[PDB]
Curated annotation (Swiss-Prot), chain A:
A GO CC term attached to the entry: ethanolamine ammonia-lyase complex
Annotated gene: eutC
The organism's taxonomic lineage, starting at the top: Bacteria, Pseudomonadati, Pseudomonadota, Gammaproteobacteria, Enterobacterales
Protein name: Ethanolamine ammonia-lyase small subunit
EC number(s) reported in the record: 4.3.1.7
Description of activity control: Inhibited by 5-adeninylpentylcobalamin (AdePeCbl), a cofactor analog. Irreversibly inhibited during catalysis by cleavage of the Co-C bond of the cobalamin coenzyme. Reactivated by EutA, which probably involves an ATP-dependent cobalamin exchange.
Species this protein is from: Escherichia coli (strain K12)
Subcellular location: Bacterial microcompartment
The reaction(s) this protein catalyses: ethanolamine = acetaldehyde + NH4(+)
Required co-factors: adenosylcob(III)alamin
Pathway recorded for this protein: Amine and polyamine degradation; ethanolamine degradation
Induction trigger: When grown in ethanolamine and adenosylcobalamin (AdoCbl) (at protein level). Note this experiment was done in strain JM109, which expresses the eut operon.
This protein's domain notes: Partial trypsin digestion of this subunit (removing the first 28 residues) yields an active protein less susceptible to aggregation.
Cofactor note: Binds 1 AdoCbl between the large and small subunits, with 6 cofactors per holoenzyme.
Record key words, sorted: Bacterial microcompartment, Cobalamin, Cobalt, Lyase
From Swiss-Prot, chains B, C, D:
Family to which the UniProt record says this protein belongs: Belongs to the EutB family.
Pfam families in UniProt: EutB
Function: Catalyzes the deamination of various vicinal amino-alcohols to oxo compounds. Allows this organism to utilize ethanolamine as the sole source of nitrogen and carbon in the presence of external vitamin B12. It is spontaneously inactivated by its substrate and reactivated by EutA.
Main localisation: other
GO molecular function, one term: ethanolamine ammonia-lyase activity
Protein name: Ethanolamine ammonia-lyase large subunit
Domain of life from the UniProt record: Bacteria
Amino acid sequence: ALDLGSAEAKAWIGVENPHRADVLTELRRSTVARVCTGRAGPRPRTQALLRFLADHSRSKDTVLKEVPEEWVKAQGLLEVRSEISDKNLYLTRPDMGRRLCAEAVEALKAQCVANPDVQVVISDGLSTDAITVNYEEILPPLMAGLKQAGLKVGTPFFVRYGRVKIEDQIGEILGAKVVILLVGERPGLGQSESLSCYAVYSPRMATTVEADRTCISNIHQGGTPPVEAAAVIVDLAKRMLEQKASGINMT
Amino acid sequence: MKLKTTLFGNVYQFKDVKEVLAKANELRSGDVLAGVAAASSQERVAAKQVLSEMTVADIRNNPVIAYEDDCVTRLIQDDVNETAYNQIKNWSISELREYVLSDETSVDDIAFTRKGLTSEVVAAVAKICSNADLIYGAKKMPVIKKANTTIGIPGTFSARLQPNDTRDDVQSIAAQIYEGLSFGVGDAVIGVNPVTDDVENLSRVLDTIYGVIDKFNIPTQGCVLAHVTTQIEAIRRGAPGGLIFQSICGSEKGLKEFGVELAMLDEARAVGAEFNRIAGENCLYFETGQGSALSAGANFGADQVTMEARNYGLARHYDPFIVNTVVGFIGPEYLYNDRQIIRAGLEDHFMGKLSGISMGCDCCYTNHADADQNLNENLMILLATAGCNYIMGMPLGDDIMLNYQTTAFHDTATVRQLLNLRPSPEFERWLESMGIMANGRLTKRAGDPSLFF
Amino acid sequence: MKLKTTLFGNVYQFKDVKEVLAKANELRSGDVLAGVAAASSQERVAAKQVLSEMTVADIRNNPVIAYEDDCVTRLIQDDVNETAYNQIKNWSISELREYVLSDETSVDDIAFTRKGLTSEVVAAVAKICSNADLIYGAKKMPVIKKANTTIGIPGTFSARLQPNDTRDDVQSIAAQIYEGLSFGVGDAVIGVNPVTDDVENLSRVLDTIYGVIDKFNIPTQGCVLAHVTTQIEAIRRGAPGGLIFQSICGSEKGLKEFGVELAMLDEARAVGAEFNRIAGENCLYFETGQGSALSAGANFGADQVTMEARNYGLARHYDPFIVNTVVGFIGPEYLYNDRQIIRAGLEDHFMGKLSGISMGCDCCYTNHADADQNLNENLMILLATAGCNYIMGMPLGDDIMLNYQTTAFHDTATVRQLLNLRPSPEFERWLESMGIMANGRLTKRAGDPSLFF
Amino acid sequence: MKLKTTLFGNVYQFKDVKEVLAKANELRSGDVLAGVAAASSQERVAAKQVLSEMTVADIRNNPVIAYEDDCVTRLIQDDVNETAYNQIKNWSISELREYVLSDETSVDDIAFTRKGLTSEVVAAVAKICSNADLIYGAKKMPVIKKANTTIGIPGTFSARLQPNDTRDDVQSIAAQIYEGLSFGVGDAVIGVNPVTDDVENLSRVLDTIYGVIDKFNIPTQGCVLAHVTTQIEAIRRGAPGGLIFQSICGSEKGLKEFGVELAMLDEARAVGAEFNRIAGENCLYFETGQGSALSAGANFGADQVTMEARNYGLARHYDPFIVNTVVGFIGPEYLYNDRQIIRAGLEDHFMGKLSGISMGCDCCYTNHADADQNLNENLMILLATAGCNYIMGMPLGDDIMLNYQTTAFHDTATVRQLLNLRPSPEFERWLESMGIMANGRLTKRAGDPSLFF
Ligand code: B12
Ligand SMILES: C[C@H]1O[C@@H](n2cnc3c(N)ncnc32)[C@H](O)[C@@H]1O
Ligand SMILES: C[C@H]1O[C@@H](n2cnc3c(N)ncnc32)[C@H](O)[C@@H]1O
Ligand SMILES: C[C@H]1O[C@@H](n2cnc3c(N)ncnc32)[C@H](O)[C@@H]1O
C-alpha cells in the first residue's frame, strides 16, 4: 500500500545494490530533488515515474485555481483586477495582465494614499497558493517593518490576473517612490507555494526596464521562509530610498 | 521582389518583408499574441511561397529592425563575409533551402556559404522547412567547439548537469551533482541557475562545483548562470571561472530589458582569457528562446522565429562554447502545446546550426502549458538524431527552483545507448576510469551517486 | 489483488481489471468515445499504479473477453508456454516493465519471457511506460523475419512501396513503383491496396508488379491487399504469389466484421507453402490499428490499447513476415491529434515487438484529424530509433486513392541517412548494382524513375 | 634566484636573466656576432644549469625588453592566462622541460599549461633540450588549424607551393604551380614572394593563382607575400583573398624595421573576415626566422633564440592559419653551417608548437653559408618526425628569384611516402580525383604537370 503523495513515497530510495546505502539516505534528505530513485536500464523506475505523473496531476490543478473574493476581504483588502477577465485569457495575453482596467485606474487614486514612499502590492500571478499559504506569515510582519520607522506606507491592495510589469502603472498612478509586489510564480511539480517579490524604485511605464527590479524568489517553507523574507524586503526597501535606484543600478 | 502571390486564383498581398516572414511561420500562440500571424492556412502558405521566391539580398537588405537603430542588427550585418554574400545574393530562399538540404553540399561548402548570411535569411530558410528538413539539415551542419570537453562531434551527445536549489544550498546542489555524474551527465557544463544574485552566494556555489571537479579531476567546467556582471566580479575576486553565461535577446531593446551591453560580452571574453580554467579556446555560454523579444515589447512587429534567429547571429560574433534554447521555458502564451514546442525545438537548433554556433536545446515545458513529460522525450530524441549538441539534465527532469520540468539524467543515457552515441571523448574517458561507463553504456554500478564516497 | 489505491488521501477504487487496463491509458479520444477513459489525470495515474501492482497472473487470468466466448482469447491463451508463464506469473507489471527495460535483460532472455505472456499482459506494460520507455524498450527487442529479403536486423530500415491508383490502372501503379524503387523503397514489400475486389483485377495488379520484379531481378515480393479469400483464389488460379495479406481485429466478432475466420488464415499459410515465390519462411502480412474493434462494436468495454495488443497475440500465431499498425488511418474519433497519433504509434510498435512479431508502422494521418505531415516526420524518426522494422512510402506520401497522407519515398531515404541505416541486405545489394545506392546513401542519379528506362 | 653556479670547482656567475638565456644557447655564429654567446662549453653548460634552476616566474617577470617600452612584450604579457600561470609560476625550467616531455602529459594538459607561459619561458625550455628532446617534445604538441584545408593533424604533412619568378611573369608562375600540384604540393598554400610591391602586380599574381584554383576546384588558398598594407589594399580593391601574409619581428623596433604596426595586423584579420575566400576560421600567415631582430638592431642584447620565441608569442595572438620559420634564409652571419641550421630549425619548430601556433618551417640555406641541399633533406625529415606542419616546395627547391635553395616538390612526396603521411584530407581528396595520388602515394602519371592539359 503506497500513497504517492506520502512522505515515505517521497523518501523512497530506488537504487539497487548501492555502493553506500547510508550515503544515499544522506543525499536524499540533503535535497528536495528526486535524487536516488535508481534506474531500470537507462530509464526511470516505475514508482518514480508514478510519483512524477501523480505530482504532475496535482500541479496542473493548481494552475487555474483562484483565490476567493471571500479570502481577500477576510484579509480586509482592496481587490482590483487587470484587463483580464478570467484565468484562461490570463494565461495567453500577458499584455492585458500588465495593464489595469478602467474602473481599476480610478479606484487606485480614490481609495489609496497619494504619492506613498513604499507601495506594497499583492497579486496571484501564476499561483494562488503562493499567496494563501505564505500571507499571514509575510504580509503582516512586513507591514510593521516598513512603518518603523520609515515611510509613507501605501495602503496595500490585491491585483487579480496581475503580471510583474503592471507595478510600473501602480508606481505612477500612486506616485510611489518604491513599489513591492508579492506575486505567485509558475507552479512547480512538487509544490505551488513559491512566492516572489519584484521591487522597483520610482517605476515608469515609458522608461523602466526589467533589469531595474530587485527579485527575491522561492519564498516558501522549502525556500526562503516568509518571516525572514519580510525582514529582507523592508531592508531592501530601506536601501532603495537611500540610493534612489533599484535592482541592477544598486550598490 | 514581389510581396504578392496568387493561390487558387486568390490574391494575397503582404506589406513588407517583415510580414512575409511572420506569416510564413507555422502556427504558434506567440505570433498570434504578436498579431503577426497569418489569418488563414491559405494565407500562411502564400507567405511561404512569396518568401520562397525572394532572394538573399531582399532579406539581407530588410532586417526586421533597421541598422541605424539596433546594435544587434549592426553586429549581424557588420560580420557578413561579403564575398560569400555576393555569390549567393541572388539565390532564392527556395534555392538556399535546396542547397542546404543537398547531399552534394559538403560541410565545407556550408562553412563558407553561411558567412554570407544574416539571421533574417537564416529564419527565412527555416520557415519553408518541414520538421524532417529541419532535422536532416541541422544534422549535416555539425558545429564543434571545445572547453575542457569537446562538444558537437558527430556521434557524440553531451549533457549539462543542472543542479538547482530553492536556497542555493550547496549540500543540495552537491547531492544532484553526484546524481548527474552517475548517469554520465556533465560533459557540456555543470551549470547552476542561482536563486539569488550576489557574488558571495555565487562564489560559494562555484567552490562547491569545482571542489567536486578537482577532487575526482573531472574534465568539465563549472558555471553559475547569474547576470554576466556578477559572474565577472565573482571571477575577478578569485572564484574559479569555467564558462561565462548570459541570457541574450535579438534586439538592442531586448538586451536592455536584461541589463546587458555588448561591451559586457566583450568583457566576459577578456575575463575568461585572463582567469578561466579552460584548456580549449571556447569559454562563453548563451541561452535563447522564442518569445523573449516579444515579452520585452522588443520585437518591433517581427515574429518570434526571426527574432530568435538574430540571437544566433549575435552569439556567433562571440564564438561561444555552447548555445542552447530553453524551448518551452516561459509559457503557453508564446508556445502553446506539444506540436508548437517540438516545432520550436527543431527550428531553433537548425537555425543555430546554420548560424555556425554550437547549438543545444533545453527540451522543457511549464505546468501551465498543454504538455507533459512525454513531450520532452519526443523532442529530446528528435534533436539527438539531428545532432543536437547537448540537452539539460536534472533528477527525473524536476527543477525544484525554476518550477518547470526538463530532461532527466536518465534521458541522456537513453539517447546515447539508443542511438549509439558517446559523451564528450575527454569526459567519456573519465567515466570509464570511474567505472560509470563501458562501450558507451552505463555499467551495473552506474546510476548510484553513493559511488563517489 | 487490489483494485483500489489511495492517491493524495483520496481512495481510488476500480471495478475489475478491464477498467484498470482502460483508465491507465494515456488520454485519447477513443477511450472517451468508449466510456472506458479515466475521469482525470489523478485517476489515470491511480489506474496505472493499481495496474503496476497487479501481477502477470492477475491479468493473464482476466482476459477482456472470456475464453469460452472468443476464439482469439482461445488462440492467445492456448499458445502460452506455461513453463515460461509459471516463472513470471507472480511478477507485478511494474517488475515486468523494469525487466524489459533492464540493460541486464538480453534479447534471448526476452525471447523466452515473452512466451509466458498474454496480449493483455503486453498491453499492461505498454500502459505504464513513458514514450522513451516505449522507444528504448522496443529497440532492445528486435524481431527478424525473412522472405525474399531480410527485415528487422538492427541497423537496417525497410519500406513498403504503396502504389495505389483510383482505378487500379496499371500505368499509374507502374509509375509510382518506378518512382519508389528509385528512392530505395520496396524491400518490405510492393503492396497494393486495391480499389476493387475481383480476381481478374489482382492478377492484373500482380502481373504488373512482378513484370518489373522479374525484369530487374529485384529481390523482393508483391502483394495486393484485397480480402484474403480473393488473394487465395487469384493465386490458386495462376497469379504470382508473394505475401498474402489480411486485416485483422482483436476479437472474434471483429474478425467477422471483416469476413475473416481463422481457418482462412491457416489456408493462407498453406497456399503460401505450395504457391508463393518466397525464398524465406515468412510470407504472411497483417495490418492492425487502434480503433478497429470499437468501430466494429467488437471491443466489449475494453480499450483500444488492450484490444490492439490482442491483434499481435493473434498475428504471432501465424508467424507472418511483417505486421504494421496503421496508426492514424481511420480518423479523429479514435485518435484526435499529434499527441495521440505519436503516443499510439509508440505503444503499438512496442507492443508488437514484445509479442514477438515483425512490427512496422504506417505513420499516417487523415485530413479530418488534427494533424499534418510534420506529424508523419516526427513519428517515423522516433519509431526508427525504436528500431521499427518498416514504414510505408508513396510520392510525398499522398495516397490518391485512400485519401490519407502517409510517408514519402523521400522519408525512408532521409531516416536511413540521418540514422546511418541500410535496407534489407538483399535489397541493398540490388540497389547498388542498379547504381541507386552507394554506402547506404542515394547516388546522384537516384530519385529519378526514368533510370529504369 | 641564483645567477651563479659552481661547475668543476670553478664558480660561474652571470649578470641577469638575459645573459643566462643567451649563454645557455647552443653555439651559433649569431650569438657571437651579438656578443651574448658563452665563452666556452663549460660556461654554456653552466648557463643551462642556472637556467634550468630558475623558475617560470623568474623568467616571466624578466622580459628581455621591458613592459613599458615594447608593445610586443605588452602583447605577450597581456595575453597570459594568469590562472594557468599561477599554477606553474614556481616550477623551475627543468621541471617544465620534464613536464612537456612526460608521456603522462596529455595534449589537453599542455593546452592549458602553455597559456601561463611567456615567450621567454618557451625559449628557456628550448635552450635546455637536446635535439631529440626538441623533436619528441614538439611531436606531442600538435597544433591544428583550418582554412580551405586542414593542417597539422598527426599523420598528415602539408607543403606550400612557392612559385617565384624573377619578373612575376604569370607564365613562369603558372608553370611551377602546375609542376607542384603534380607532386601533391599546395595544401598549405600557393604562396608567392613578389619581386615588386605594387597593387596591380599582386592582383595579376592572385588572379593567376585563382584561375587554376577555380578551374580544377582545388581545395586550397592563395597568397602573394608582399607587405600587408599592399595585400589589404589589393583585396579591398577586388583581388581574390586567401591568406594574408606579413613578416614579423619579436620587438616593436623590429616591426618598425618592416613597416609594421600591430594595428595593421588587426586590420588584416578584419579584411579577411569580410573579403577572403576561406571556409575555415584561420586565414593569417606570418613568417619568422633567427636573426631578424639582430639585423634590425632591434634585439637589445637578447639572443636570437629568445627573440625568435617572442615572434611566436606575438603570432599566437592573431591565431594565424600557418607560421613557418625561414631557418637558413638570411645567411651565415647568424647561422653558419649544417649543425646550426638544423639545431635552430628544431628549436624554432619546438618553440612554435609550445606557443600553440601552426608551426611549419622553410628548411633552406643560402649559397654563401656553409651548407648544401643534403642539409635540406636531413632537416625536413627530422622536422617531419617532429610533426612539422608544412615545408616549402619549388622545382628542385631552386628559387630562381630569392637566390636560396629550399626543398623540392619531390621532397614533400618523399617524406609522405617514407613516413606514411598524407596531405590535408581535403587536398588529398582532390588529388585522388585528379589521379595524382592513391593511398598517399604518387600514381604513375604523377609528377607530370601536362596532366592538367
Ligand atoms: C520565466 C523566468 C524568466 C523569463 C521571463 C520570461 C517570461 N515572460 O516569463 C526569462 C527567460 C526572460 C528570464 C530571464 C532572466 N531571468 Co529569470 N526567471 C524566470 C522564472 C523561472 C519564473 C518567473 C515567474 O514565474 N514569475 C511570476 C510571473 C507571474 O511573473 P511574470 O510577470 O509572468 O514574469 C516576469 C518576471 O518573472 C520577470 N523576470 C523573469 N526573470 C527575472 C529575473 C530578474 C533578475 C528580474 C528582475 C525579473 C525577472 O520578467 C517577466 C516578464 O516581465 C524565475 C524562477 C522563479 N522561481 O520564479 C526566474 C528568475 C526570476 N530569473 C532569474 C534570472 C537570474 C534571470 C536572468 C537575469 C538570467 C541572466 N543571467 O540573464 C534573466 C534576465 C531577467 C531580466 N533582466 O529580465 C533568477 C532571479 C535571481 C534573483 N535573485 O534575482 C530567477 C529567480 C531564477 C533563475 N536563475 O533563472 N527569467
Ligand atoms: C533557465 C535559465 O535560462 C534562461 N532563459 C530561459 N529562457 C530564455 C530565453 N527565451 N532567452 C534567454 N534566456 C532564457 C533564464 O535566465 C533562466 O534563468
Ligand atoms: C490501409 C489498409 O490497411 C488496413 N487497415 C487500416 N487500418 C486498420 C486496422 N485498424 N485494423 C486492420 N486493418 C487496417 C485496411 O485493410 C486498409 O486496406
Ligand atoms: C622569404 C620570405 O620570408 C620572409 N622572411 C624570411 N626570413 C624571415 C625572418 N627571419 N623574419 C620574418 N620574415 C622572414 C620574408 O618576408 C621573405 O619575403
